[PDB]
Amino acid sequence: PLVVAASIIAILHLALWILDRL
Ligand SMILES: CCCCCCCCO[C@@H]1O[C@H](CO)[C@@H](O)[C@H](O)[C@H]1O
């Protein structure tokens, strides 16, 4: 479950980081 939680946070951060810079 920590692997899943960390991966979700990492992917959300990636998506938001890209969005901000589009
Ligand atoms: C790729 C990273 C390893 C993934 C391991 C998947 C097995 C998860 O491990 C399981 O976690 C569950 C907790 O809800 C429970 O079934 C057990 O406590 C644990 O064995």
Ligand 1 contact via 2 beta carbon (within 6 Å): no
Contacts 24+ apart (CB under 8 A), 18-21: none
Distance CA 9, CA 22 (A): 20
Ligand 1 mean position, distance from CA 9 (Å): 18
Technique used: X-ray
Q: Tokens 């479950």 label which residue?
A: 1
Tokens of 11: 């992917």
Ligand 1 contact via 3 beta carbon (within 6 Å): yes
The data reach a resolution, in angstroms, of 1.5
Ligand 1 contact via 4 beta carbon (within 6 Å): no
Single-letter code of the amino acid located at 14 = L
Single-letter code of the amino acid located at 12 = L
Q: Which residues of 3-14 are buried (b: 16+ CB within 10 A; e: fewer)?
A: eeeeeeeeeeee
DSSP string covering the chain, please? Answer: -HHHHHHHHHHHHHHHHHHHH-
